[PDB]
């Protein structure tokens, strides 16, 4: 792999695609997921690294217990 990690493309996109596949013909759910991913991209453009920090803090809460 060597070159290139982008928390949004690395973790969020595939996670959200997998989320949709838990219930594929759910229009309202898939729309909700799509809107949220778009807003995460807006936040990431305003503060590079913020998504990574969100995921880290999320994980930390569960590891610490």
């Amino acid at each position: 792999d060597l070159v290139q990690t982008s928390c949004l493309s690395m973790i969020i996109t595939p996670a959200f695609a997998e989320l949709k596949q838990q219930d594929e013909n759910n229009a309202s759910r898939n729309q909700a997921i799509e809107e949220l991913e778009k807003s995460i991209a807006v936040a990431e453009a305003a503060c590079p690294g913020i998504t990574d920090k969100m995921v880290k803090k999320l994980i930390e809460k569960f590891q610490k217990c």
């Binding site: 949220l36 807003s39 936040a43 305003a46 920090k53």
Partner: protein
């Protein structure tokens, strides 16, 4: 404010608060977006958290972890008012949630767990007594909401008791953890109702 939406408030809100220290705008953008998605499809925030944990190889039970964090982030739930009656409500709420949060550690120690069950019943009684006192003190403001929340609490407490009884037969701990989280959620909803009495 439904049960299924609990993880938004219990897990994500504290994360957003911490992100506010990095960048206020970005944090609020994430906050508003998670709130909107949860409103559109209750249960989504839970699914998202579990999926992210899986992608990061964090091998934990979500229900149990939620319960263990029940005493955390006190400022998100407490009534921010100085009068003794609100302090008393806060303290009764905190005591209940603290005892419940220790179930995952205590449940495998039978002697200790028997004591935990008695401490829970005592803490429930004292919370409900305080709730009724403050309700009367403020002249039955927020009446419909508080009567409904009190009714659901009593229902959830009976259901928690039934779950303990079953646990003594079948040893399936997860069911106790689910039922305990429900009581935590209902405690928080009652606290929230007292935020708007005057």
């Amino acid at each position: 404010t439904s049960m299924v939406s609990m993880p938004l408030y219990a897990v994500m809100y504290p994360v957003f608060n911490e992100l506010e220290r990095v960048n206020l705008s970005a944090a609020q953008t994430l906050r508003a977006a998670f709130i909107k998605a949860e409103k559109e499809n209750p249960g989504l925030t839970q699914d998202i958290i579990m999926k992210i944990l899986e992608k990061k190889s964090v091998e934990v039970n979500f229900t149990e972890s939620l319960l263990r964090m029940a005493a955390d982030d006190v400022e998100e739930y407490m009534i921010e008012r100085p009068e003794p009656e609100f302090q008393d409500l806060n303290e009764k709420a905190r005591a209940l949630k603290q005892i419940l949060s220790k179930i995952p550690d205590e449940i495998n120690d039978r002697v200790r767990f028997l004591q935990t069950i008695k401490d829970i019943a005592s803490a429930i009684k004292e919370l409900l007594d305080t709730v009724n006192n403050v309700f009367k003190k403020y002249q039955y403001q927020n009446r419909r909401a508080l009567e409904h929340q009190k009714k659901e609490f009593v229902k959830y407490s009976k259901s928690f008791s039934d779950t303990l009884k079953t646990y003594f037969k079948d040893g399936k701990a997860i069911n106790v953890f689910v039922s305990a989280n429900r009581l935590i959620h209902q405690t928080n909803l009652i606290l929230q109702t007292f935020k708007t009495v005057a």
